[PDB]
Structure formats: structure tokens, C-alpha cells
Design a protein around this ligand. Structure first.
Ligand code: HEC
Ligand code: HEC
Ligand code: HEC
Ligand code: HEC
Ligand code: HEC
Ligand code: HEC
Ligand code: HEC
Ligand code: HEC
Ligand code: HEC
Ligand code: HEC
Ligand SMILES: [Ca+2]
Ligand SMILES: [Ca+2]
Ligand SMILES: [Ca+2]
Ligand SMILES: [Ca+2]
Length: 627
């Protein structure tokens, strides 16, 4: 017995006896009543002091009325709370909005049914009817974009409304610590201008992901009537969380301000909203001005691929590349072979900067039809490694010079791409060709897609933008399949051009795509993701292992490549052999048909000999599952 989702509703609030009696109804995912909850609580009872009541320009704030763990299980899915010590401070005012924060701890019913954590708030007037006014600015869903839903965010709770219900102005005032008010703390912990906590943690990682982008948490909503407070209610307490060098009292960094009375007079909502979103809005507009449509064909005689790039405008109308060449900062074409198991490795792949700072490479031309045309020079070894090796796949990344939200001429032929304020990564593309002229093979894209990446990195993520690459913006341009609802899947299959089974530039980096994303995020995003496979995966495509060969897993002493059988390679990214993270010894893994950091030939020969999935039945919900 296990409940998937515990739903909680406050269905009745009665003040007929003085302190409120609060009834909560608990249901599961099938809307069935949940009887026997042992850890249900009113974590906070609050009332809302309205905007400006504590002084001109000041925020609304949640005044404390107490808490209760005293309830009766009514044996029908409902639970009725009483307060032993309601409103200890004697501040209860029936003219104010009343809030209850209800939490149910993860654990078990008597029958031993597992129950997950649940949290909610609901607001009422002072007689238990619907409320007359609210402070509804954000909703828990925005935090779940980046923080694993149902797990504690830092401490105490899993949903932002619970945080807000404890980290009040009254709480911060009572501790003599303005910074622990939630409206200060939330921006402070994602912004690197000052450290937080006893340890002076500098939020470097949070700053690099959030980038002060208000729209990752402040989202327009009909369900949130105070959503525009982020631009409409400027206060020194909140604005100082990132603007840490102003002293309003002393007029240092700013004209003196002794209260919040005049902030809105100068800091109008339009200006605050525009200035903090201007750069991301401008970049997004630049990215959406142009597209590319890419084709590739194989010469049946020479077995070279010819890649043709059509620039298009926002409407999909042809643009002759000659008209914008002076503003093309880079265009790169990377070609590999065998989309399900790349065969050329990193050193064998075909690659070219066809354009650099307005200059065509001599190997690339613009034809009379205004398309860029480039022919591979590397041996593509088409057809030399089974049916999959009939297909060449070419990834096109490009960038355009830009300044303050406008495209500009690339004025410097040697511009090295380090200063990312001087150009924009544009929409990348993927083109398939076959030697045989049959339909191309394509990689599966049904287990991970760019929608997952975009939850943390935004849809405008210019991947690898800098000295080495133009910046790859991943969109429906390189979609070749739809999901069961007919939505275009934006896959990471193009990334395999470089993220090959042989790795990237070094054999030591687990460069294979099957290893690299999981390696990077277990090392650098563990605080957000940990073991949460669902942060990237809708599914595991375990059938894909039947199309894989050896995967590079290490470098030998002499810098040559060591390889594992593919399931072992994939699991050992996190579960390092010989470490505290892997019970199976090397000898045991070999007993299950694996090659562990051996030769490419031994790993290739054994690649379909692994018995792992006889015992292991991993799902995204539980990757650890065994018979
Ligand atoms: C992605 C765009 C994010 C959204 C939306 C939110 N958070 Fe976040 N948070 C994010 C990162 C990358 C980090 C740094 C993690 C690290 O390992 O350093 C954080 C950090 C926090 C913290 C600090 C605790 C810590 O883990 O360092 C807290 C308390 C926090 N975040 C809370 C939080 C809440 C309540 C959000 C919804 C309003 C929220 N975050 C959104 C990335 C993102
Ligand atoms: C009371 C019931 C709490 C709830 C719910 C949450 N937090 Fe909390 N938090 C609480 C206390 C008593 C303290 C210590 C404050 C102090 O005096 O120093 C904290 C501290 C934090 C901090 C550290 C803040 C800083 O040092 O600048 C963070 C980052 C924090 N809390 C985050 C947080 C989040 C995201 C919550 C919802 C998931 C949350 N807290 C709930 C008490 C309470
Ligand atoms: C999530 C990580 C956030 C980002 C990024 C930004 N804000 Fe935010 N803000 C967030 C929360 C959870 C809250 C508390 C809401 C509540 O119900 O208490 C806020 C609050 C503000 C406020 C206070 C509004 C008020 O009524 O006093 C302002 C003025 C505010 N936020 C502004 C703001 C701006 C300008 C940001 C981009 C630079 C921004 N926020 C980012 C969560 C997050
Ligand atoms: C961190 C999440 C921030 C919060 C909260 C606030 N601001 Fe901010 N502000 C932030 C950044 C990263 C920048 C630079 C923006 C850019 O792209 O140029 C700003 C800038 C300002 C400015 C203009 C710069 C100046 O020198 O005046 C103003 C006037 C400004 N911010 C005001 C402001 C107000 C009134 C806030 C509370 C509502 C506020 N900011 C919060 C980051 C963050
Ligand atoms: C008009 C007379 C003002 C009043 C009243 C307040 N502020 Fe202000 N502020 C004003 C200007 C002209 C600027 C510089 C704008 C620019 O783009 O250069 C500012 C700047 C800020 C900033 C940003 C500081 C920085 O980035 O260096 C913040 C965070 C800020 N102001 C907040 C603020 C608050 C909270 C106020 C009421 C207490 C307030 N300001 C009053 C003009 C005026
Ligand atoms: C939030 C839970 C994340 C999801 C989902 C994905 N990524 Fe991520 N990524 C995340 C963090 C916290 C970091 C480290 C940031 C730091 O400052 O250290 C990363 C790092 C990357 C990098 C490195 C480049 C960078 O811009 O920092 C890349 C290239 C990257 N991530 C790509 C990426 C892709 C393609 C994803 C979908 C498979 C993906 N990430 C998911 C947080 C999160
Ligand atoms: C060749 C032109 C490449 C293409 C196309 C892509 N990547 Fe890459 N990536 C490349 C190298 C040479 C390296 C460094 C060596 C290494 O293997 O680590 C990388 C690195 C990454 C990383 C690690 C963090 C980082 O350095 O940014 C990640 C998470 C990564 N690459 C992801 C990735 C994705 C999602 C791609 C398709 C959108 C992609 N890369 C393409 C070389 C090349
Ligand atoms: C985003 C940062 C990821 C997280 C978190 C996890 N995985 Fe992953 N995984 C990711 C990518 C980009 C790929 C490559 C897809 C490709 O086309 O090669 C993978 C691949 C796997 C595979 C191979 C089978 C497949 O579905 O493609 C397995 C078995 C796999 N990943 C397992 C796995 C587990 C168990 C995770 C949680 C502990 C996990 N992944 C997280 C990106 C990310
Ligand atoms: C990093 C993205 C991971 C990859 C890739 C895989 N696993 Fe994993 N696994 C991971 C974590 C963070 C944890 C929790 C560790 C803990 O605290 O216990 C796990 C756990 C397991 C377990 C249960 C633990 C045990 O001692 O057996 C199993 C059985 C397990 N993982 C299996 C497994 C398999 C078969 C994988 C390849 C398909 C695999 N994991 C990849 C993180 C990651
Ligand atoms: C049945 C006879 C098994 C075969 C065949 C393989 N594994 Fe296994 N594995 C098995 C058990 C009972 C456990 C422990 C489960 C638990 O919850 O404790 C495991 C564990 C792993 C783990 C997790 C390791 C850790 O966290 O310490 C991984 C990554 C793992 N196994 C991988 C794996 C691979 C790659 C195999 C084929 C070569 C393989 N296992 C075979 C049972 C069995
Ligand atoms: Ca209700
Ligand atoms: Ca909830
Ligand atoms: Ca900070
Ligand atoms: Ca295309």
C-alpha cells in the first residue's frame, strides 16, 4: 500500500467558540479519503497586516497567531484541529485575512500504507468565509523548476508558502535579523553580491543559474493577484538583498531615505520591471530574428557529405547569407557517423568554422541561391560499421555580432569570442544524409529533452558559448520526432557529434553523452538534483543499449583510451568502481559479462554480454529497483 499524492483542503473554519476550529480533508491521487494521518499539523496560524499599514510604501506582512498539533481523526478523511494556546500575543483581529499553513509529514498509516509529505496554505476572512484581500505573489511551482519537488529546499519544508509562513517580518524583527525575512533571504541566497549564513556561503552557483532573472520566480498569473508586487512594492528591506552597497540612512550609494514612503514615486513599476528584464528580453528577441534550415547529401562516389545552410527570417522566409555575412560571428559544422553509436570519435569527426567574424573559410562558399555550402574532408567511413553507419549527422551552431540588443558588423577579424556581451548564439540545426539514399537512422530522443535542461538553464541557453564555440541554442529546428501528445521533441542527439563513445579531446573526461551530462550534474548540481533522475529523464531507454558499443571510461598511463561495456559505463559515472559508491567489485562486474576500463576491442566484443538487466529493473521513479 502506497499513496502517490496526498491532497489537503481546509474545508471549514469556525470561530463560534473563540479560537478557530479548523477542518482539513485529506485525499489521495484517486480522490479517495485518507484515514489515519498521524503527523498532520497546523504549522502556522497567521493574519495579514495590509500593505502600507506599518508605514507608507511598506509591505503587507503575516502576523503570528500560533500553531497546533491537536486534532481528531474523524474517520472519514476529515481531521478537526483545536488550539490549546491560540493567539498568545492577543493580536487576533477578525477584520484581517486569516491564513493556516497545514503540513503532513511523510510516514505511514497504521495498516503500513506509505504517505508522502504534503503542505498547503489557505486564506479566509475573520469568520472563516473567503478572504477579502491577499498577499499572493509567487506559487510553489516556480521553485520546483530547479529544486526537486517533494524534497526539503535547504531545511524545514518543501513548498515556498511554508517558508513564507515562518520567515515573516515579525520573525526577523523578533530575532533582530532583518535579512531572515523571506522577501530578503530568497534573493540573498541566489545572488553573489553578499554571502549568507555563519559560513559566509557566496552564492556563486545560484548566481550562475538564476542570473538575477526575476521571471524565474515572478510569473504573471490570474491565481496570484499580487504577482506584480516584485515591481510595484520597492522597499529598502527587499531591494537591498542584491543591492548590498547602498546605505539609505547615510545616503551612501543613493540619496538618503529614512523610510519607504517615496521609493515608488521614482522607482515606477514600468522602470523596475523593464530594467531588470531588459538584457534577457533583448537576447531572446535577437535569437528569434533568424533561423537556419540545413540539408546534407552524400556523394555516392566520393562518400563526402555536402551541408547546405539556408538562413531564414522570423517568418521562415529565405534570407541570402550574403546580406548578413558581415554580422555572422561564427558558423561551425560538425559531422559524425552512426547517430546511435558515433563511429568517428572526437579526433575523427569532420569540423569547420565555415565563418569567423564575417569571413568565409576558403572551404565554404555561398551559392547563387544564397545558401552556405560545405563538403566534408575527413573520411566519414560510411557503411564501415553496420546499418547505423549508413547515416552521417551534421550539427550547425552559429552566432551573430550584437551590441545592446542590436545585430552589428563583426568589425574585428581576430575577435576570440571570450567577451559574450559582443555576440549572440543563434538557433542550432541538425541534418542527416545516407550513403545508400535510404531513410536515415536517428538516435532515440524519448528519454531526455531540452525542456528538462530549460527548467534550470532557460530555453535561451547558448550552450558552450565562448572562446571555443558560437553557442548552441537548441530548438524545434533540430526536432525529428513528436511525443505521444504531438509536441516536437528537441533532443540532445546532435551533441553526440563531439560527445562520442570515444569521448571528447581527452580519454579521461567521460566525454560520451551517456556519461557527460550525468558526470557534470552529479559533481556540480548535486545540491539541486542529487539522485533525482526525473530532473532530466521522462524515461530510461534501456532498449538503446542494444545499439551501443564500448564507451570510453578512463585514460591509461600512456594517455590512450580505456573502455567499458555500455551499461557498466553508464552506471559507473556516479557508482565509481572501487569506491564507497559501488558494492560490485571489478571481478563481480566481469562475472556479469562487463569489461571495466579495458581495451576498446574487449569492451566492443563484450558490449551485448552484460547481464545487469536480469536483476536491475530501473525506472525514473526508482532507478535502484532490483528483483
Ligand atoms: C532555477 C532557475 C532556480 C529557481 C527557480 C529557484 N532556485 Fe533556489 N537555488 C538554485 C541554485 C542553482 C541554487 C544554488 C544551489 C547550490 O548547490 O549552491 C539555489 C539555492 C537555494 C537556496 C540556498 C540553499 C542552497 O542550496 O545553497 C535556497 C534556500 C533556495 N534556493 C530556495 C528557493 C526557493 C524557495 C525557490 C522558489 C521561490 C527557489 N529557490 C527557486 C536555483 C533555483
Ligand atoms: C520556521 C517554522 C521555519 C520554516 C518553515 C522555515 N525556516 Fe528557514 N529558518 C528558520 C530559523 C529559525 C532560521 C535561523 C534564523 C537565524 O536566526 O539565523 C532559519 C534560517 C534559514 C536560512 C539561513 C538564512 C541566513 O542565514 O541568512 C535559509 C536559507 C532558510 N532558513 C531557508 C528556508 C526555506 C527555503 C524554507 C522553506 C522550504 C524555510 N527556510 C522554512 C525557520 C524556518
Ligand atoms: C526566486 C528564486 C526569485 C527570484 C529570482 C526573484 N524573486 Fe523576488 N521574491 C521571491 C519570493 C519567494 C518573494 C516573497 C513573496 C511573498 O509572498 O512574500 C519575493 C518577493 C519580492 C518582493 C517583495 C514584494 C512585496 O510585496 O514586498 C520584491 C519587490 C521582489 N521580490 C523583487 C524581485 C526583483 C526585482 C527580482 C529580479 C531582479 C526578483 N524579485 C527575483 C522570489 C524571487
Ligand atoms: C537581485 C535578484 C536583485 C534584486 C532583488 C533587485 N535588483 Fe535591481 N538590479 C539587479 C541587477 C543584476 C542589476 C543590473 C541590471 C542590468 O542588466 O544592467 C540591477 C539594476 C538596478 C537599477 C539600475 C542600476 C542603477 O545603478 O541604478 C535600479 C534602479 C535597480 N536595480 C533598482 C531595484 C529596486 C528598486 C529593487 C527592489 C524593487 C531592486 N532593484 C531589486 C539585481 C536586483
Ligand atoms: C527619486 C528622488 C528617488 C527616490 C525617492 C528613491 N530612489 Fe532609488 N534611485 C533613484 C535613481 C535616480 C537611481 C539611479 C538610477 C540609475 O539607473 O542609475 C536610484 C537607484 C536605486 C537602486 C540601484 C542602486 C544601484 O544599482 O547602484 C536601488 C536598489 C534603489 N534605488 C532603491 C530605492 C528604494 C528602496 C527607495 C525607497 C527607500 C528609493 N530607491 C528611493 C531615484 C530615487
Ligand atoms: C537544474 C536542476 C538543472 C537541470 C535540470 C540541468 N542543469 Fe545543467 N547545470 C546546473 C547547475 C546547478 C550547473 C552548475 C552551474 C555552476 O555554476 O557550476 C549546471 C551546469 C551545466 C553546464 C556547464 C555550463 C554552464 O553554463 O554552467 C552545461 C553545459 C549544462 N549544465 C547543461 C545542461 C543540459 C544540456 C541539461 C539537460 C540535459 C542540463 N544542464 C540540466 C543545473 C541544471
Ligand atoms: C564539439 C564541437 C562539441 C559539441 C557539438 C558539444 N560539445 Fe559539449 N563539450 C565539448 C568539449 C571539447 C568539452 C570539454 C571536455 C569534456 O568532455 O568535458 C565539452 C564539455 C561539456 C560538458 C561539461 C561542462 C562544460 O565543459 O561545459 C557538458 C555538460 C557538455 N559538454 C554538454 C553538451 C551538450 C548538451 C551539447 C549539445 C547541445 C554539447 N555539449 C555539444 C565539445 C562539444
Ligand atoms: C541531466 C543532468 C541528467 C540527469 C539528472 C540524469 N541523466 Fe541520465 N542521461 C542524460 C543524458 C543527456 C543522457 C544521454 C542520452 C543519449 O542520447 O545518449 C542520459 C542517458 C542515460 C541512460 C542511457 C539510456 C537513455 O535513456 O538514453 C541511462 C540508463 C541513464 N541516463 C540513467 C540515469 C539515472 C539512473 C539517473 C538518476 C540517478 C540519471 N540518468 C540522471 C542526462 C541526465
Ligand atoms: C549519478 C547521476 C547516478 C548514476 C548515473 C546512477 N546512479 Fe544509482 N544512485 C545514485 C545515487 C545518488 C544513489 C543514492 C546513494 C545512497 O545514498 O544510497 C544511487 C543509488 C543506487 C542504488 C541503491 C544503493 C545500493 O547500495 O545499492 C542502486 C541499486 C543503484 N543506484 C543502481 C544504479 C544502476 C543499476 C545504474 C545504471 C543503470 C545507476 N544506479 C546509475 C546515483 C546514480
Ligand atoms: C543480480 C544477480 C545482479 C546482477 C546481475 C547485477 N547486479 Fe547490480 N546490484 C544488485 C544488488 C542486489 C544490489 C544492491 C541493491 C541495494 O539496494 O543494495 C546491486 C547494486 C548495484 C549498484 C548500486 C551500487 C551502490 O550504490 O553501492 C549499481 C550501480 C549496480 N548494481 C550496477 C550493476 C551493473 C552495471 C551490472 C551489470 C554489469 C550489475 N549491477 C549486475 C544485483 C545485481
Ligand atoms: Ca478550502
Ligand atoms: Ca502543496
Ligand atoms: Ca547574497
Ligand atoms: Ca532543421
Amino acid at each position: 500500500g502506497s499513496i502517490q499524492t496526498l491532497n489537503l483542503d481546509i474545508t471549514k473554519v469556525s470561530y463560534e467558540n473563540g479560537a478557530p476550529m479548523v477542518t482539513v480533508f485529506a485525499t489521495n491521487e484517486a480522490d479517495m479519503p485518507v484515514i489515519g494521518l498521524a503527523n498532520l499539523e497546523i504549522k502556522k496560524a497567521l493574519q495579514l497586516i495590509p500593505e502600507g499599514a506599518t508605514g507608507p510604501g511598506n509591505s503587507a506582512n503575516w502576523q503570528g497567531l500560533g500553531s497546533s498539533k491537536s486534532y481528531v481523526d474523524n474517520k472519514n478523511g476529515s481531521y478537526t484541529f483545536k488550539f490549546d494556546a491560540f493567539d498568545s500575543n492577543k493580536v487576533f483581529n477578525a477584520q484581517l485575512t486569516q491564513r493556516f499553513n497545514v503540513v503532513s509529514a511523510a510516514g505511514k498509516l497504521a495498516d503500513g500504507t506509505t504517505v508522502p509529505v504534503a503542505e498547503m496554505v489557505e486564506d479566509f476572512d475573520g469568520q472563516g468565509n473567503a478572504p477579502q484581500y491577499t498577499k499572493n505573489i509567487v506559487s510553489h511551482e516556480v521553485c520546483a523548476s530547479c529544486h526537486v519537488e517533494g524534497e526539503k529546499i535547504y531545511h524545514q519544508a518543501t513548498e515556498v508558502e511554508t517558508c513564507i509562513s515562518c520567515h515573516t517580518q515579525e520573525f526577523a524583527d523578533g530575532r533582530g535579523k532583518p535579512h531572515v525575512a523571506f522577501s530578503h533571504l530568497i534573493h540573498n541566497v541566489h545572488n553573489a553580491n553578499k554571502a549568507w549564513g555563519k559560513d559566509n556561503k557566496i552564492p556563486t552557483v545560484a548566481q550562475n543559474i538564476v542570473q538575477d532573472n526575476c521571471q524565474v520566480c515572478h510569473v504573471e498569473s490570474d491565481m496570484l493577484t499580487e504577482a506584480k508586487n516584485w515591481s510595484r512594492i520597492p522597499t529598502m528591506e527587499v531591494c537591498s538583498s542584491c543591492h548590498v552597497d547602498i546605505d539609505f540612512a547615510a545616503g551612501k550609494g543613493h540619496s538618503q531615505q529614512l523610510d519607504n514612503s517615496n521609493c515608488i514615486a521614482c522607482h515606477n513599476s514600468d522602470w523596475t520591471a523593464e530594467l531588470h528584464t531588459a538584457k534577457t528580453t533583448a537576447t531572446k528577441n535577437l535569437i528569434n530574428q533568424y533561423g537556419i534550415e540545413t540539408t546534407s547529401t552524400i556523394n555516392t562516389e566520393t562518400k563526402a557529405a555536402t551541408i547546405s545552410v539556408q538562413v531564414v527570417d522570423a517568418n521562415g522566409t529565405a534570407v541570402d547569407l550574403k546580406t548578413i555575412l558581415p554580422k555572422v560571428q561564427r558558423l561551425e559544422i560538425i559531422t559524425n557517423v552512426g547517430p546511435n553509436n558515433a563511429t568517428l570519435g572526437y579526433s575523427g569527426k569532420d569540423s569547420i568554422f565555415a565563418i569567423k567574424n564575417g569571413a568565409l573559410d576558403p572551404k565554404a562558399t555561398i551559392n547563387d541561391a544564397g545558401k552556405l555550402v560545405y563538403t566534408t574532408t575527413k573520411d566519414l567511413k560510411l557503411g564501415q560499421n553496420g546499418a547505423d553507419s549508413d547515416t552521417a549527422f551534421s550539427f550547425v551552431g552559429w552566432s551573430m555580432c550584437s551590441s545592446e540588443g542590436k545585430f552589428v558588423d563583426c568589425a574585428d577579424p581576430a575577435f576570440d569570442g571570450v567577451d559574450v556581451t559582443k555576440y549572440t548564439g543563434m538557433k542550432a540545426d541538425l541534418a542527416f544524409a545516407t550513403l545508400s539514399g535510404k531513410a536515415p537512422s536517428t538516435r532515440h530522443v524519448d528519454s531526455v529533452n531540452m525542456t528538462a535542461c530549460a527548467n534550470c538553464h532557460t530555453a535561451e541557453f547558448e550552450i558552450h558559448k565562448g572562446k571555443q564555440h558560437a553557442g548552441f541554442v537548441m530548438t524545434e529546428q533540430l526536432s525529428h520526432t513528436q511525443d505521444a501528445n504531438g509536441k516536437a521533441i528537441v533532443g540532445l542527439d546532435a551533441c553526440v557529434t563531439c560527445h562520442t563513445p570515444d569521448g571528447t579531446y581527452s580519454f579521461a573526461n567521460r566525454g560520451a553523452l551517456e556519461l557527460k551530462l550525468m558526470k557534470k550534474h552529479v559533481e556540480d548540481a548535486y545540491g539541486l538534483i542529487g539522485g533525482n533522475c526525473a530532473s532530466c529523464h521522462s524515461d530510461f531507454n534501456l532498449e538503446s543499449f542494444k545499439k551501443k558499443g564500448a564507451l570510453n571510461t578512463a585514460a591509461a598511463a600512456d594517455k590512450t583510451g580505456l573502455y567499458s561495456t555500455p551499461i557498466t559505463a553508464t552506471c559507473t559515472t556516479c557508482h565509481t568502481v572501487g569506491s564507497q559508491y559501488m558494492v560490485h567489485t571489478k571481478e563481480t562486474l566481469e562475472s556479469f559479462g562487463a569489461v571495466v576500463d579495458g581495451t576498446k576491442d574487449d569492451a566492443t566484443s563484450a558490449a551485448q554480454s552484460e547481464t545487469c538487466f536480469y536483476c536491475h529493473t530501473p525506472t525514473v521513479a526508482d532507478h535502484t529497483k532490483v528483483k
